[PDB]
């Protein structure tokens, strides 16, 4: 924990809110020009944890809520998530009367304490029903996007997440009216009949310096799973798939050349860095264990 910096780190400016910049970016409205504008959604660790806990706590029923944050450039930042007092069946949720009063009161109370962020989106949980936009979510997301432009639909699946051990969070945004534009068919199948109406987004997560510092001492028995990590063995299929997509991207960039090369180089660097990190861990293990009593 020493021989480094302990003050405001380079992962804390993401948590800083600038009112003037947000006002300028809201007045600019760069989203209306290119409709494929937003492509990245950065969610805080706290927001994701709260969303997953609330979705799982609902049991087999469906739950819904809001999420705060802001928007910068080509990315949407989602910082906090607060639930709603909704009473939904196994398929549909309504949020009839007490949900909106809760929204207004909670936003006002949060602004009282110091929460300077505004509402940035809504989320609703599919209890084992995959991760896609239904014919009602599409309509309500279009309704929200028509007037409150900075918005995003987050879909979470609690049952599948708890059964498979991996979170299933999907960020989506709807195209406006009249916007038309051995390989698996899941690309069309896993979406509803409105597959051409909405498009997904790249979901990433971030955490603060204090978040990582406190989570470093979260538990002191994963060291065994790190020493006997067995890297380059549990994700070989991942690396082969990455190599295949990298070859496809290289072919596309070569066709274009005859700026697309930048993302291909980035993907290649990422895959190679992962492989080199795995080899480094294996070399460290070999030096630690097998180089003793020779």
């Amino acid at each position: 924990l020493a021989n480094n910096m302990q003050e405001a780190q380079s992962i804390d400016e993401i948590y800083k809110y600038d009112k003037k910049q947000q006002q300028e970016i809201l007045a600019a409205k760069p989203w209306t020009k290119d409709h494929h504008y937003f492509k990245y959604c950065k969610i805080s660790a706290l927001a994701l944890l709260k969303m997953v806990m609330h979705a799982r706590s609902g049991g087999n029923l469906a739950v819904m809520g809001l999420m705060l944050g802001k928007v910068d450039g080509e990315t949407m930042i989602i910082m906090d998530s607060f639930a709603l007092p909704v009473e939904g069946t196994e398929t549909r949720v309504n949020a009839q009367a007490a949900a909106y009063e809760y929204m207004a009161a909670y936003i006002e109370n949060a602004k009282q304490v110091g929460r300077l962020e505004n509402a940035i989106g809504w989320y609703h949980s599919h209890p084992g029903y995959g991760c896609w936009l239904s014919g009602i979510n599409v309509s309500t997301q279009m309704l929200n996007q028509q007037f409150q432009e900075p918005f995003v639909a987050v879909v979470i699946d609690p049952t599948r997440t708890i059964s498979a051990g991996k979170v299933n969070l999907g960020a989506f945004r709807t195209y406006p009216k009249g916007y038309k534009p051995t390989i698996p068919l899941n690309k069309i199948e896993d979406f509803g009949v409105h597959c051409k109406q909405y498009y997904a987004l790249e979901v990433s997560y971030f955490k603060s310096s204090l978040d990582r510092k406190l989570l470093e001492l979260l538990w002191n028995k994963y060291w065994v799973n790190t020493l006997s990590s067995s890297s380059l063995l549990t994700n070989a299929d991942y690396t082969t798939g990455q190599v295949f997509d990298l070859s496809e991207k290289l072919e596309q960039s070569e066709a274009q050349l005859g700026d697309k090369l930048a993302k291909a180089t980035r993907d290649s660097c990422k895959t190679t860095i992962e492989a080199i990190h795995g080899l480094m861990s294996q070399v460290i293990k070999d030096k630690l264990f097998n180089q003793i009593n020779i």
Partner: protein
């Protein structure tokens, strides 16, 4: 509404007609094609067909299968289903009767009585178990012979007889004039068992014949009452008790040489489940977006405990697809569409 077409298809002597009968049948179907609630019409027509074919004979099987074929159009092969089965059963009964007549004429040709069987199928017809009444020894020989013949022809079928939906003729010998009776099985049995002896009390009839009390009461209600001359009794209307001393009068002056006292035919006496099924249909969807019909039905059957009939499945699927909850290009597949 089907009563009109049943009466038009019924045998009526002078009612017999020509190709314009087929035209009127087509007109009836023209009035029917836009009528909703086809299930009630189909059930009523099934009952009418069973009544016309099971007991007695209709005007002609010609217009019968013509009507069946006409209902096959615009409805579907699987929708008609049973009626074609009844028609095939009647054809098989005729063929089997011809074969049995040939067999009886071939070996040990005696022919004490003239049997006429109408073997039906268990499933299609609206069957009903008989009273298990003991048959008098005159007709037991033919029952045994036909049972043996049927077992020899078809292997492993078993005959489930029904002694409540048949007719017979009795050669009465009270006095001069062989008044040929036409009776049901119960009346045949009563008269035959009364033949040996005289003046059997009602309890004696119950013991000797074995008919149920209610059916025996209904049967003995006839053979009297009408015209007050079949049997002379001091009580009128209905008066029968245990130990009653009744005997047929030793004369029958009914003024016609055709006796039909088988007049019995004339003097014959969900919301919660639908909600659960709809909820199951919705829950199966919003998951498997594109699903086949049979797969959907099997999935709902798996997800439910109580049996539920497939008709409920079909009607609820149609009702909930009417509400734009799904959409239907294969005709046996559904997309979610919300």
């Amino acid at each position: 509404i089907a009563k009109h077409v049943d009466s038009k298809l019924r045998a009526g002597n002078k009612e017999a007609t020509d190709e314009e009968l087929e035209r009127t049948l087509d007109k009836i179907m023209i009035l029917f094609r836009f009528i909703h609630g086809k299930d009630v019409f189909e059930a009523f027509y099934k009952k009418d067909l069973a009544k016309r074919l099971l007991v007695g004979k209709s005007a002609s099987v010609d217009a019968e299968k013509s009507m069946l074929s006409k209902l096959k159009h615009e409805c579907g092969a699987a929708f008609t289903s049973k009626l074609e089965g009844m028609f095939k059963d009647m054809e098989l009964s005729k063929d089997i009767m011809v074969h049995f007549k040939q067999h009886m004429q071939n070996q040990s040709d005696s022919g004490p009585i003239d049997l006429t069987v109408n073997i039906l199928t268990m499933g299609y017809w609206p069957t009903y178990t008989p009273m298990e009444v003991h048959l008098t020894p005159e007709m037991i020989k033919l029952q045994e012979v036909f049972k043996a013949f049927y077992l020899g022809k078809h292997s492993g079928r078993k005959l489930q007889w029904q002694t409540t939906l048949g007719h017979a003729v009795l050669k009465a010998e009270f006095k001069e004039g062989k008044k040929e009776f036409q009776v049901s099985l119960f009346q045949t049995l009563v008269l035959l068992m009364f033949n040996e002896g005289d003046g059997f009390s009602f309890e004696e009839i119950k013991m000797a014949t074995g008919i149920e009390d209610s059916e025996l009461r209904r049967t003995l209600q006839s053979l009297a009452c009408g015209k007050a001359r079949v049997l002379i009794k001091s009580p009128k209307g209905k008066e029968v008790e245990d130990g009653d001393k009744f005997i047929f009068n030793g004369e029958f002056k009914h003024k016609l040489f055709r006796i039909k006292i088988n007049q019995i035919q004339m003097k014959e006496t969900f919301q919660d489940r639908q909600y659960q099924i709809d909820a199951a249909i919705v829950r199966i969807m919003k998951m498997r977006k594109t699903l086949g019909h049979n797969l959907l039905v099997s999935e709902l059957y798996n997800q439910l405990k109580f049996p539920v009939k497939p008709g409920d499945l079909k009607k609820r699927i149609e009702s909930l697809i009417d509400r734009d909850y799904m959409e239907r290009d294969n005709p046996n597949q559904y997309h979610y569409v919300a």
